[PDB]
Amino acid sequence: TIGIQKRFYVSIDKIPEHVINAFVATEDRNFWHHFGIDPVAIVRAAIVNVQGGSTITQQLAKNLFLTRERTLERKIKEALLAIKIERTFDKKKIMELYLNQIYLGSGAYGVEAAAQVYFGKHVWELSLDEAALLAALPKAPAKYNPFYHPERALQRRNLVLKRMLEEGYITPEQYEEAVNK
Amino acid sequence: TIGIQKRFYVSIDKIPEHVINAFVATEDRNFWHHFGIDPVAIVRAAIVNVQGGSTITQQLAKNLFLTRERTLERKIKEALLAIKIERTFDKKKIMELYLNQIYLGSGAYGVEAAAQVYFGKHVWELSLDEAALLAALPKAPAKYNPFYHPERALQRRNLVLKRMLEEGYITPEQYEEAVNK
Numbered sequence A, B: 001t002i003g004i005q006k007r008f009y010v011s012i013d014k015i016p017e018h019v020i021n022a023f024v025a026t027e028d029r030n031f032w033h034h035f036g037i038d039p040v041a042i043v044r045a046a047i048v049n050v051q052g053g054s055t056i057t058q059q060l061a062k063n064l065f066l067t068r069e070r071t072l073e074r075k076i077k078e079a080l081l082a083i084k085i086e087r088t089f090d091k092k093k094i095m096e097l098y099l100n101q102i103y104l105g106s107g108a109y110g111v112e113a114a115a116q117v118y119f120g121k122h123v124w125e126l127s128l129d130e131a132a133l134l135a136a137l138p139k140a141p142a143k144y145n146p147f148y149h150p151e152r153a154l155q156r157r158n159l160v161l162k163r164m165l166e167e168g169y170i171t172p173e174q175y176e177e178a179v180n181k
């Protein structure tokens, strides 16, 4: 009806853990523990002879700005906003907001809209390999879109699955089966 | 445990309509229709020989800033943030976020925490006259706190009830009974 970004909203309790886990493992491994920004993650990423140091909270803050500028000043504003958001709402709520607003390509905002556009299903009906595919998109939706870059999409999906394996969110068995899907 | 502002969070479906209606009638009558800012409300308030022109969305944006400055520049940033928020999440979601973060005095953030501190009950167990009391607080929690300014508190509570009556959220009968509570 109105608001493409407001198409479908789904509560966190109806979002599969594989989905939540895929995004966390891929975009912000220490999400459940940091306070809006991850100093250690910024250092881990720094000392790399590719890695992003921003958190899920920071990605959310980034989209709360009407304009799109990547000036260092904007980066600071986004971080301060993330910090305040973290003091106001708990992790599950922040995760909920993030998952429902994230642009996942093909005009789909939020995991529910993405599930429909890419798999013709509801997010709660997604399999592990399908969840991993959605988590691969935030990096660059157009570059990894499965509709016209299925090669890169598949490659990044399996990378997400590997991240999930390393974080302990899925077992070796689940991993072997999913990367072959 | 941690985060005074994150004590209790309650979903919009568990918040009584009298509560939602009381806040809307008192703080932002056209909430369900504007786009983050209310031009007409700003004019209605302007032409007054007392009235606030900000929306619920703007009050939410105001609290997403780590610092507290009332410069015209901040006012603009808050409005732009409200506008983007409105394009990202629907009204019920914005209302939900607002109602859970609003400082209502006595260290209570959000209507649930307020219900407990002021009435020793859950927000969903509140009566009309109790809901109106919470909606009276945002204007200035310390000045209208029922614990030490019960006179002003009661006076503003009945004003909220009158606003609800005018907006058609409650009947004359309900009004007569509530103002006498």
Ligand SMILES: C[C@H](CCC(=O)NCCC[N+](C)(C)CCCS(=O)(=O)[O-])[C@H]1CC[C@H]2[C@@H]3[C@H](O)C[C@@H]4C[C@H](O)CC[C@]4(C)[C@H]3C[C@H](O)[C@]12C
Residues within 6 Å of the ligand: A037, A042, A051, A052, A053, A054, A075, A076, A077, A079, A080, A083
């Ligand atoms: C805004 C910055 C930090 C953010 C930042 O500058 N981040 C740069 C990283 C850039 N990235 C690697 C993410 C880019 C990757 C590109 S990507 O596309 O992946 O996003 C600085 C300025 C304001 C500082 C806070 C205040 O003092 C208050 C308080 C003092 C305490 O003592 C420590 C805690 C706290 C909250 C301080 C934290 C941090 O000190 C802040 C947020």
Ligand SMILES: C[C@H](CCC(=O)NCCC[N+](C)(C)CCCS(=O)(=O)[O-])[C@H]1CC[C@H]2[C@@H]3[C@H](O)C[C@@H]4C[C@H](O)CC[C@]4(C)[C@H]3C[C@H](O)[C@]12C
Residues within 6 Å of the ligand: B037, B042, B051, B052, B053, B054, B075, B076, B077, B079, B080, B083
């Ligand atoms: C930020 C301001 C508006 C807010 C403002 O300046 N508000 C002052 C009122 C102060 N109050 C009475 C609330 C104080 C009360 C004290 S209280 O304590 O009660 O809060 C200006 C600057 C940027 C402008 C937008 C952009 O152009 C984009 C777009 C153009 C379209 O053409 C019309 C729609 C839109 C969204 C424009 C709307 C509005 O034009 C904006 C937000």
